[PDB]
Amino acid sequence: QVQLQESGGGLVQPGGSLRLSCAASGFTFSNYKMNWVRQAPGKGLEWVSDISQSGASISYTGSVKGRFTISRDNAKNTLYLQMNSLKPEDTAVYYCARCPAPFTRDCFDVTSTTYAYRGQGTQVTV
Amino acid sequence: AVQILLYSLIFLLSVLGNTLVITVLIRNKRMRTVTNIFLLSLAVSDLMLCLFCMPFNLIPNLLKDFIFGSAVCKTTTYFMGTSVSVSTFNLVAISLERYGAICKPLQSRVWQTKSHALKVIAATWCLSFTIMTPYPIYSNLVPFTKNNNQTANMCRFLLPNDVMQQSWHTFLLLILFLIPGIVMMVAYGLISLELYQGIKFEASAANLMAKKRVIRMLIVIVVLFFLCWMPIFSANAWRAYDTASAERRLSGTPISFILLLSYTSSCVNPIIYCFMNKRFRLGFMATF
Amino acid sequence: DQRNEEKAQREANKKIEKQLQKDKQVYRATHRLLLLGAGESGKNTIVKQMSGIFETKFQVDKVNFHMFDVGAQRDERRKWIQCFNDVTAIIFVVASSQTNRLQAALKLFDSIWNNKWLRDTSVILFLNKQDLLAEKVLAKIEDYFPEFARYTTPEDATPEPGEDPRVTRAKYFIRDEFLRISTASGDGRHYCYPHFTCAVDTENIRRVFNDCRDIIQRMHLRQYELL
Amino acid sequence: ELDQLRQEAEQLKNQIRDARKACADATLSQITNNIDPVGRIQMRTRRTLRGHLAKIYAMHWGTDSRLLVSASQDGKLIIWDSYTTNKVHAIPLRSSWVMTCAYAPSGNYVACGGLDNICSIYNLKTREGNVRVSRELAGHTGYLSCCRFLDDNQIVTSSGDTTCALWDIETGQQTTTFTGHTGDVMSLSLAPDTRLFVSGACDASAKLWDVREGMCRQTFTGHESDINAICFFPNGNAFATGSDDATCRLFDLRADQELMTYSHDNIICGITSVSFSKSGRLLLAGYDDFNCNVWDALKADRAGVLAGHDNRVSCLGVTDDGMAVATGSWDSFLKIWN
Amino acid sequence: TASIAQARKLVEQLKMEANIDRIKVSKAAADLMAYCEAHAKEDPLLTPVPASENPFR
Ligand SMILES: COc1cc(-c2nc(NC(=O)c3cc4cc(C)cc(C)c4n3CC(=O)O)sc2CCC2CCCCC2)c(OC)cc1Cl
């Protein structure tokens, strides 16, 4: 059984910061890509950040550039999101989604209703 | 003085080239596209030239000594004539399919099928065997070529008692060289124009480079058709009209060179049309 | 006497093969198009003006096109998308500017493009509802895509005379965000054919025919490539 | 109250993990280890079945152990004589997007379906010589990934709706619906007693389904990703599964544990199909690299390789008498290996 | 707690699976092996069939 467990959420005031992370278990993933997914209250799920298995960042949604950063450590099986100065618009549930297959470039659909639960999740309120 | 070594080399290269194309296109399957129907037919008419033109024509011409029965003389020539007409017509058919496939994509998909390609092949071979029929005229002449009053028994195609020698060679010129020369030239000129307009507009580096390579080969094919076959069609028509002037000049610039250049078309056809093609990695699969 | 059964089987095989050869001739003359796209992208206006799988048939210049429309297995969607790799093209419909629908469309586009089984399939891209973009923009991109603040149109842009420059830069910005994905991979094995449209006419929609002509020509040329 | 239920589920998951660890007094690899190897296994293509214009999505052997039915993208099912290579039937489909097919054990009819969300049953015993649809089964909303026949006019189907169902092909009705998967159900395999069925799904799990009860008896885990194919071990108490994590696993239904894994450092290809030989000693698996491998099911080694497909292997099948292995592919040819 | 509608099914299904009487692997593994040896002689892909007895050869 594959598991991803999120921690580090909570209430922060505008301008403050959080460090969210997931501990991965039940798998070897040094062969897989990782994705941060966010769900605002009243909305569907949106993609936020994408890191390759090599540790190189690939991308961020434009709305978080310069504010959020990601990293991973394949030695401890962990995934991290550093959330710097935050605004009320960043209030959401954060999830650690992962891609469906090893050794690939494609990755979908990490934001779907029934996929995106992987790594479910924690509430961050700004 | 060593031209015989050149003649045996060309023979071996031509035979192996066509033998492998014929073998691969059957042995490996996973092909039999309309394109392969024509390439196989072309490789087959090339062996007929390879295996007849050398031993029963180009070599006897070096020797001025031909040893044969009269039926050998007569049969072999209608064969060689057939092979010239067939390889010419197969090259035209190939150029027309390339035109359709590139200049009219979506529409060639409707008319271009195996039931079409085989009507064309059957018509090409059946027609060639009905226009080379005057070859059962060629016979045994006996000029003196040796030191002990011996004759050569050389064969010659002579149309008796008439101007028909001119009508015949003029006919083959216009309906075997000039017309198919032009049809290939136009079909390829149109493909090159379209690919060219596209490459200039677009300028995927990989695609721009692939288009340049295709255009260069379309040009090479037209040039070699004209370079290999024109000299012989012209040499025959010339003498047909002025025998004394022709024979005087043509032995001065030996006809053996001219005849060998058209012979080599049986060497080159399989290289341009099959061995340099990316897909003829299937040849490896078939023999290795 | 069992030979009588062998004769019967051979005759049955002959009738079957004749029908299959007739069908082969039809199959190769028919083009297959997948209609795929972002939610609320106007998939319906592309098909109107141009239970599982819906099929619309079109004819343009005596060539037959079958397009597979929208519904059924719509959202999951990674296991059925593979059924459509053997198509002439994927027609991907995205509307040009709730959630960040454009970023979602860009991620969906990349998921076609870099999928190992869709690596050889070309995409016809319609950036729809350009009139929606025009009103929203002249009255919105930079809220989701901050890079837009510094974007200018290319010298190769062909704006409609009289069109508001803020809209023309918005249109080309969006187009370029899709193209920068396309230009990153394949090395020319597949192509993207972007167009700007609206639910107004079929002149731009008919470009599917012209794009199919280019897609098929490129495929045919592969048989003539050199070692 | 939701928080209490979440805690109860986690506590129960641990009770199950401990119950399973309690049985871990051996691995198959410590039981089999002194057993002679199968040695090198080689096969050759004996027959090639040509005629499809498009990729093969599914294939199935009949019970007379001579006929094959295959399904492809160009809109047809073809019923083949595996000995003579002749076509017996060719059946046009209403919709070409066919993902699965099945041959009835009685030989009287054929099932198929796909993105149309309909399982269509064709009657082969036709007085006109014309094979016609006798019935259509609809009520599914997702694609049909798999269907298998039962006697007494019943068919078991699975779909992209995450569910499976038992249908009565008399009325076109479902009688039993099986739920509990969260991902698409990719495959079905019927137990030899056809009272238990196993369902594989895109949530990296497999479930053992009690057919008469309409419920899940046991859930198996172990794969990292989606399961694409499942087959039962011939003697009823184990099933082999293949997935997108490029490995195969052997599961023990009595121990409720994976028993063995099959993998190699040079395989990063997904598994599209698995099947067993009659003794259960040779495990066959089709891959994304257009090879099919033969595994020594007790020693987990590679007994041999079946090469010769030019595209993705889409499906394997072994005839009931054990004489031959058929392999379907995306290169449109169906080959029979011996 | 709308989601409790499904959380309840997770708990009930796990509770039922938690009551399975499980068999030790050493024994189950040995039985699996015994099947394979007992029927090895009957399997043509493991023990090849002479051409005269093989419909495909
Ligand atoms: C065009 O199409 C065909 C052509 C010929 C044909 N024609 C020849 N010409 C002379 O040999 C000649 C012409 C000539 C003219 C002048 C002014 C002077 C001299 C010394 C001349 N010679 C030398 C000589 O006669 O000794 S060779 C030949 C064999 C055919 C092979 C074709 C491939 C390449 C090798 C030859 C034919 O086989 C008979 C069948 C066909 Cl269909």
Question: Does the beta-carbon distance from C187 to B211 stay under 8 Å?
Answer: no
Query: Which residues does residue B139 pair with via DSSP β-bridges, in sequence order?
Result: B156
Q: Are D77 and D93 in contact (CB under 8 A)?
A: yes
Resolution (A): 3.0
Domain span at residue D84? 1-337
CB nearest to E20's CB, from D256, D321, D338? D256
**Residue C54 touches chain D, beta carbons under 8 Å:** no
Domain span at residue E11? 1-57
Question: Does the beta-carbon distance from D226 to A100 stay under 8 Å?
Answer: yes
The total number of structural domains that make up chain D? 1
- Cα separation, C174 vs C134, whole angstroms: 12
Q: Contacts of residue D75 in chain C, CB cutoff 8 Å?
A: 23
Domain span at residue B199? 1-288
Question: Does the beta-carbon distance from D224 to A100 stay under 8 Å?
Answer: no
Q: Is the CB of B239 under 6 A from ligand 1?
A: yes
Q: Of C103, C114, C92, C181, which is closest to residue C146 (Cα–Cα)?
A: C103
Domain span at residue A66? 3-124
The total number of structural domains that make up chain E? 1
- Cα separation, B76 vs C210, whole angstroms: 52
Question: Does the beta-carbon distance from C116 to A106 stay under 8 Å?
Answer: yes
CB nearest to A44's CB, from C99, C115, C145? C99
Which is the closest atom of ligand 1 to the Cα of B249? 17
- Cα separation, A45 vs A113, whole angstroms: 8
- What is the residue whose two structure tokens read 């269907």? D147
The total number of structural domains that make up chain B? 1
Give me D16's structure tokens.
Answer: 């199950």
**Residue E44 touches chain D, beta carbons under 8 Å:** yes
Residue B177: CB partners within 8 Å, gap ≥ 6? B88, B229, B230, B233
Out of B236, B251, B256, mutate this one to test ligand 1's pocket (max ligand atoms within 8 Å of CB): namely B236
Give me B95's structure tokens.
Answer: 């150029």
- Place domain C3-132+177-224 in its CATH homologous superfamily: P-loop containing nucleotide triphosphate hydrolases (3.40.50.300)
Interface test with D, best of A2, A103, A108, A123 (most D CBs within 10 A): A2
Question: Does the beta-carbon distance from E20 to D32 stay under 8 Å?
Answer: no
The total number of structural domains that make up chain A? 1
DSSP label at residue B273? I
Rg of chain D, C-alpha, whole Å? 20
**Residue C79 touches chain D, beta carbons under 8 Å:** yes
- Cα separation, E7 vs D324, whole angstroms: 47
- By DSSP bridging, strand C192-196 and strand C122-128 are parallel
Q: Contacts of residue B98 in chain C, CB cutoff 8 Å?
A: 224
Give me B212's structure tokens.
Answer: 């340049």
Residue D49: CB partners within 8 Å, gap ≥ 6? D68, D70, D78, D80, D82, D85, D333, D334, D335, D336
CB nearest to C116's CB, from A63, A65, A104? A104
- Cα separation, C126 vs C46, whole angstroms: 9
- Cα separation, D114 vs B105, whole angstroms: 31
Domain extent listing, chain C: 3-132+177-224
- Cα separation, D287 vs D335, whole angstroms: 15
First to last CA, chain D: 60
DSSP label at residue D28? G
CATH number of the structural domain spanning residue A26: 2.60.40.10
Between helix B243-252 and helix B205-241 the angle, nearest 10°, is 130
- Cα separation, A10 vs A124, whole angstroms: 5
CATH number of the structural domain spanning residue D210: 2.130.10.10
- Cα separation, B117 vs B121, whole angstroms: 6
